Design a protein around this nucleic acid. Structure first.
Lengths: 84, 97, 105, 93, 94, 78, 92, 103
DNA sequence: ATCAGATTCCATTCGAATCCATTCGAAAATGATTACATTCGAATCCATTCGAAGATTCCATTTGAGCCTGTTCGAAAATTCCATTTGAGTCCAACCAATGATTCCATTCATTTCCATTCAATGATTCCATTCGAATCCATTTGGAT
DNA sequence: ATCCAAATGGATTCGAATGGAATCATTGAATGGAAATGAATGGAATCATTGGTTGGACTCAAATGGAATTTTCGAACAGGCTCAAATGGAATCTTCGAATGGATTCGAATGTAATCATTTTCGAATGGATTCGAATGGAATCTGAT
């Protein structure tokens, strides 16, 4: 498969802008869209790391939504609706 | 031609998305991004669609929450606009730094 | 041939909650009344959440509860919101709140 | 592939409260998440409870003081009630 | 001595110290009152009131550093209640 | 007794947090927040004390409470 | 009766720093540290054994537990010190 | 003759084994888990005690009292992250003073 | 800036006092040790599930023009808050005198644990039923310009 | 207050995915007769704390005095909102091979389990200490005016 480089830029200016709306934000500065993609990255790393560690104590090479779940739980952000 | 004045399609949009629950990041660009983070973590990994859906969900949750707290940091300093300085204050008091 | 869910007047299976107490290694032995009292607290908590949800379910004109309704149910009930402070609902949404200072002059 | 869920009992308790209204399988899911989360928070709290006092069994008193410890305010009251009667009605055969 | 730098010197005074900054047990006075509004004929271990005071002032120094950052964020050098409430709201304590 | 925690004690606690200038309405907000804290902790503390059917709070119980609140304490045995 | 770690934290201390000792208050803090950490690790191991539904906690569980709790290279160094302790034990 | 020596550790392995069975973690305890764990505990204490000794004296005091422990933990990023949610008795704060407030 | 007088830290020695040191007996603990149990680490053959790729629609993304208003600006007014002495007010800590409140036994009964051995409960199936995710509309805005 | 313009509701209808039944079969609650504990149970030393009353002593509470932070302005600057035409690529669909799970068989290798006997570890004093609270002298420092 093709190389995976630079997908954090698929999170566009508008998608970040909506996510500002539903959080109740009026005017969005220019320096925000980089700073958003920054924090989102850190976030998804810490969760995806922790998901995959579960996957491979599980000795599976498919990440289960349960492992996404446990991961999130471990982080202090409990998620409902994917518990199966 | 008519131009709605600065800020009032913004308010229209806050009420727009707050009254909806749809996922706000486009699903495929996200899905790649997850495969990149996951792969440059570990290789030859496969996902359940429920597992990226789970992710994106938790993610927009996380982000929209942070955006509310950021906006309060904006308001507190008497600004109408969120800057990075705000996000760094929010995540500092949230204890993420 | 008596089921325990009847003997305490509950819908939530007490026998099950007993098995799950043992299969969870919470302590080596389980009293007879602990699974009961707990199946009570869970059935009660379910009940409370479900008919608070129904309220906003029919205030948005719908015969059926979708996660949104649940989310609005929890977020508007102070004690439940507090209980679920760290929980995030699948497909939940937010409360239509707008900070005051952002309204026109 | 067959094992467990609470969906039966959330469905009945649903008909008890709001007999008109139905439930969509996603929102049903979120309730499963809720029962599971809460079962776990309570049983853990009770288990550390038995442990701090060095006793090998979990009783109703343990589940109770667990419920008093997790739940905020008035649903903590309402819960202790609902349980105390579930139990006194139990020991009555 | 000029305004504001006996403040700095005092910052260094106590940060360079670990002393309990609240007096004795006017604190435990307050502890026993709060406690008996919960239950009566209660007794404390001296270690337990010390424990409380400890975690409590710890808590307070935390809230004051965060509030102070809120003060800075608003261009101000002085802490106001508005700040304490912003801090306590972001922490999720409200 | 909430004012047995005096203004000087409060301002010192403001110092160790590294603050320059203190508002007049602060000490009030302080006594408020300390009160909510000491309340949520002591409540959970006492619940630990009398599930034990002991009516004297052990420092262990304060520790457990603090653990349960998410503010962990080291040095009293937990 | 009853237990404390003060013995082994004292040994480990002077093994590491034969220069320095420890004041009983700081000793307490150390006991608390060991207890907290033991607890976090063992619990995470226990849910780990549960999420994949197996009745034993092995070295392998303690391991992905430690990878889960400890950040970065303190996790790597830790996986080490323990992974060696175990084979030098098992060699008899 | 103790398993701690046979694995080369100062931290009691037998104790950790018992404390694993009676802590209700699962009905069965592997043979290597208590060892590997007793190792992580000896190591982590060790690391702490050493950073604590270093920071114990640049100020020339005999031994490690709580403050020394505090400065040890709060200065080492990985420890501070691990223990961010812990509060040390008699600890203190790092002498930080925000710049905007300096002369 | 390098005077210029005070507080003030910032240290080099002292005669002590609150610990920690190693010692020094008396439980509780670990380690073996044969003798059972069990868990799974080890082979399969099924069966879900996912990765992929091509194609066609049009929903959004982007990008740049244009300018309103929100940020930062320097300044000017008004006020809350630091520094500083003085009153006296309540602490530090000091033992110290009392019997409540722990907590550890050496008894028993009630209670939970086992373990087959059935009895319903519950969960997986289609199985064909209804709210509803789209689809326009105009009533009702609501907007910003006259 | 005025007519005007896109946008916002929320009430009509349309085929379709979704929910909620009835039905057959696999687990799992549940009976019920012994096996093993568990918690009070009344009965006792022991610890660990309420309780006053005691003095020197900071530590507090007020109240002068003014100095700079904060507020408020009013102005300059620029950044972000808004709009519109291209079009990029997501979203949808439906295909399809087979890597990767998974139910279920299966046994050597691992962990329990009484049952002992040996030692580690605790607790409690007993003998050098190690740093607390002064003692000041000296930069070091802060800040008032030739």
């Amino acid at each position: 498969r093709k190389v995976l480089r630079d997908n954090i830029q698929g999170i566009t200016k508008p998608a970040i802008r909506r996510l500002a709306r539903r959080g109740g934000v009026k005017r969005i500065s220019g320096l925000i869209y980089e700073e958003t993609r920054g924090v989102l990255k850190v976030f998804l790393e810490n969760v995806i790391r922790d998901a995959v560690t579960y996957t491979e104590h599980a000795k599976r090479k498919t990440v289960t939504a349960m492992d996404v779940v446990y991961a999130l739980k471990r982080q202090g952000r409990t998620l409902y609706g994917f518990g199966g | 031609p008519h131009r709605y004045r600065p800020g009032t399609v913004a308010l229209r949009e806050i009420r727009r998305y707050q009254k909806s629950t749809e996922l706000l990041i486009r699903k495929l660009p996200f899905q790649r991004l997850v495969r990149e983070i996951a792969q440059d973590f570990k290789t030859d990994l496969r996902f359940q669609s429920s597992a990226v859906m789970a992710l994106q969900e938790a993610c927009e949750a996380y982000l929209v929450g942070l955006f509310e707290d950021t906006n309060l940091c904006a308001i507190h300093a008497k600004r109408v606009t969120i800057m990075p300085k705000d996000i760094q204050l929010a995540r500092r008091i949230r204890g993420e730094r | 041939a008596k089921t325990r869910s009847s003997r305490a007047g509950l819908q939530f299976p007490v026998g099950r909650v007993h098995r799950l107490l043992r299969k969870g290694n919470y302590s080596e032995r389980v009293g007879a009344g602990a699974p009961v009292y707990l199946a009570a607290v869970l059935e009660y908590l379910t009940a409370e959440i479900l008919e608070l949800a129904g309220n906003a379910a029919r205030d948005n004109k719908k015969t059926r509860i979708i996660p949104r309704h649940l989310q609005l149910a929890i977020r508007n009930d102070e004690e439940l919101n507090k209980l679920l402070g760290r929980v995030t609902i699948a497909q939940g949404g937010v409360l239509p709140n707008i900070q005051a200072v952002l309204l026109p002059k | 592939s067959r094992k467990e869920s609470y969906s039966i009992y959330v469905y009945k308790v649903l008909k008890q409260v709001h007999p008109d209204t139905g439930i969509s399988s996603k929102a049903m899911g979120i309730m499963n998440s809720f029962v599971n989360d809460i079962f776990e928070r309570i049983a853990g709290e009770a288990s550390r409870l038995a442990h701090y006092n060095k006793r090998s069994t979990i009783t109703s008193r343990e589940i109770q003081t667990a419920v008093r410890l997790l739940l905020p305010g008035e649903l903590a009251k309402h819960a202790v009630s609902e349980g105390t009667k579930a139990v006194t009605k139990y020991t009555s055969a």
